[PDB]
């Protein structure tokens, strides 16, 4: 099964033909790609608000309008999907959802409210894939960009009625039937803990910090908790790299930022006629971003390390999450550069999977975003930035979907692609519980 | 090669599963989908602003989220592919393209500056698909609910400097060197009179009313031309349904309109805060829509019946024209209501080619355009309104690229979809001149 090695413009875009990205029929290549084998192992690679207008836009900018992402353009299967959400009152559906009520649906197969994690409309808790993956035998992973405790990573190990119940003191007022101290099953980083995947790696270490009102732990921070129960912690680069094994028996929970992890680049947020009354903007690195700090990438490939070992399989999620945030924020660089950081994860991923020759990998986003790309000369109502690209020439991002402090998602569907054995799954029209299903299926999870 | 028969929720979208679209794996049924034989014929459509965000926000509205359009979403292949133009002066891409552009690019193979139309940025002539189709001895349609100067069907039979060229006395000024009285080929109007395509329907009477400035005609109206150079002419269904041939001999220009052809359904205008301080609406179809107006459905049908009598084959180009233009003006129901309309014409045309068995169907748009599908409780910086969807529930639109009187067209990539010989060229990122190759090769075209 190939991966679409390169599917950037062939030549003089300027010329006849030199805009084209292929370079014979595609149809011998299609006909290799497919495969119903079982998968021993899959990789999800999550792009937290990564639409296909958030592709194009961190395309252009840094590969150039005829250039190609080298791990998010090359996988060959695409489709789209759906990720409406339900209303909780009437269960009709919520056009535009959530975090917490996307991640859910590929997490569990069924549909449910925004704000929720791991349960139904009934706030029902539904095992997640993870929980199903673990209970078969099979090793698992969940990285973020993000707090651990935010609802991409936190929907694979976590059955709460609401995603503000981070840690105790928060559960306690917000889902009081799930708080500790009155029965539940605990706060989403207490039940993060319970869920013990293989390897659990991001940011969120703050609320780790809190302490538990209840049970064996009360008293103990939840960080003391999980060096008691045998995970093994880490808190930067290096000792991430000196980790060796992971498994139930040495868990491994890497912490590497209070907060969400730092962003790649920097620039400046847009602005009410930005274009026009501004000048070009050239995003920076942050000299922030740190080489103590690992990069997704970094996180990914240890993770594939780790997990690889384990004979029976394993299931790995990686969430790019920044993207969402910055988009929020109406920050270009910022957004851009986190897609530009997923597409280096999801090259790893495709790296291994290649060789490997039994791992389904998917990439795709939990929900469209505010982003779009617009004429230099626009005069909107919004925020907009004009951005030099590589091609060396001006791209212009707006964001006017809200007048308020934060950019909107949006509910158009999006691109959904996969390479590897039911990668077919993902081609033509599909809904975002589907995704629970193939995988399922494709790892014989029963 | 099978279409997607049903992709609508399986069930109770509130029960886990039931939100589902598939129901096996589909694997074998890609398998069976791919061909590389040679397609006898090839039927294009275009929904003019058509992305991704159009696509759902029409079908939550007339089929509610967990519906599925019979024609539009039923097509097996998948992609998503890159529109974006060039400067004409720096040769240096731009990244938001107009009609006239994108339409070359797709009918030319070569990439071109926003406004131009069937020429280079160096304004040099280059051969469209039909014009290939033609000399190949293959039937041609064109076939539009916008007038017939318009970019997108103009493409295929002009070339022109400028999209404003329509007819005399606007070549004169704004392309003198298109300008017949000027030693050039004339403009759009007259050329399309010499293209002599076999079916050309769609509206734009109003400039077949000038008459040449130059030429064998001089003096005489472009209707009056057409009439004596053989072209038969129908100006309504009824007389449109009487047509039994069309060719070479006895070519057919069917004008249905002054400017564009009617809309389908009709409502309010998107206002500022329209979702907050005004009612949810519902679209009513146009009473004027006409029962003597041919639909895009039926102008498909009959240009199918007559292009299929040719032995050699046929290319058809379709475009559900006003989606475009209801989105420039920010009127939600008449977008939608043309998406609707389109899916008519996509299931005329997936019912034949699947009787037929050598016909490429494809299903795309020139660009992507500024709707955006948003909370009920946006409050958003530009147009809005609050529609009440199939499913009894209210979805809200955004427009918020322009404060000027049109929305801007967007960016971002969007979806492409096939079915037949050769789809397997639209799967993956593509580019739009992919497109003209892709059907010049199915076709067999040299
Ligand atoms: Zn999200
Ligand atoms: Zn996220
Ligand atoms: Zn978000
Ligand atoms: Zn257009
Ligand atoms: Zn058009
Ligand atoms: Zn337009």
Redesign the interface.
């Known amino acids: 099964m190939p991966v ?1 090695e390169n ?1 950037a ?1 062939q030549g003089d ?10 370079t014979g ?7 290799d790609s ?3 084998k079982p998968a021993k192992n899959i990789i999800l690679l999550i792009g937290d608000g990564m ?3 958030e ?3 961190a395309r ?1 900018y840094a590969e ?3 250039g ?1 992402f080298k791990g998010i ?1 090359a ?6 999907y ?1 990720h ?1 959400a ?2 909780k009152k ?7 959802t959530d975090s917490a009520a996307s991640a859910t ?1 590929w997490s ?4 449910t409210y925004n704000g929720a994690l791991g349960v ?2 009934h706030e029902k808790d ?1 095992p997640t894939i993870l929980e199903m993956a673990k209970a078969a035998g099979l090793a698992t992973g969940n990285v973020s960009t993000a707090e651990l405790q935010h609802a991409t990573p936190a929907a694979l190990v976590a059955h709460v009625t609401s995603r503000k119940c981070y840690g105790p003191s928060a559960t306690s007022e917000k889902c009081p039937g799930n708080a500790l101290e009155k029965g539940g099953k605990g706060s989403i980083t207490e039940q993060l803990l319970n869920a013990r995947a293989d390897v659990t790696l991001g940011g969120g270490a703050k609320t780790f910090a809190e302490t538990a009102t209840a049970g064996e732990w009360q008293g103990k921070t939840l960080r003391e908790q999980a060096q008691a129960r045998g995970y093994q912690l880490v808190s930067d680069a290096a000792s991430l790299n000196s980790v060796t094994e992971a498994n139930q028996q040495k868990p491994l929970l890497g912490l590497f930022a209070d907060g969400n992890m730092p962003v790649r680049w920097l620039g400046p947020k847009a602005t009410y006629h930005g274009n026009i009354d501004k000048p070009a903007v050239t995003c920076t690195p942050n000299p922030q971003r740190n080489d103590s700090v690992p990069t997704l990438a970094q996180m990914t490939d240890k993770a594939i390390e780790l997990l690889s070992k384990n004979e029976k399989g394993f299931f790995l999620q990686v969430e790019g999450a920044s993207i969402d945030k910055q988009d929020h924020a109406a920050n270009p660089c910022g957004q851009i550069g986190e897609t530009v950081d997923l597409d280096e994860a999801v090259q790893r991923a495709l790296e291994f999977a290649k060789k490997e020759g039994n791992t389904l990998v998917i990439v795709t986003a939990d929900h ?1 975003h ?1 982003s ?4 230099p000369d ?5 925020l907009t930035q004009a951005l030099n ?1 590589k ?3 001006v ?1 212009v991002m ?1 964001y ?5 402090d934060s950019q ?8 959904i ?1 996969a390479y590897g054995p ?1 990668a ?2 993902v ?8 995704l629970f ?2 995988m399922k ?1 494709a790892l014989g999870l029963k």
């Open positions: 679409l599917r413009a875009i300027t010329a006849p033909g030199g805009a084209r990205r292929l029929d595609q149809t011998a290549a299609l006909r497919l495969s119903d639409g296909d207008s592709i194009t836009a252009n150039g309008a005829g190609f353009d996988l060959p299967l695409t489709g789209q759906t409406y339900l209303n009437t269960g009709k559906p919520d056009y535009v649906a569990t197969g069924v549909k139904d409309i539904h469209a505010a779009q790309i617009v004429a626009t005069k909107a109502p919004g690209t091609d060396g020439a791209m707006s006017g979907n809200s007048e308020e909107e998602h949006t509910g158009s569907q999006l691109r692609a039911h077919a799954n081609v033509g029209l599909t809904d975002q519980t589907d299903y193939t299926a």
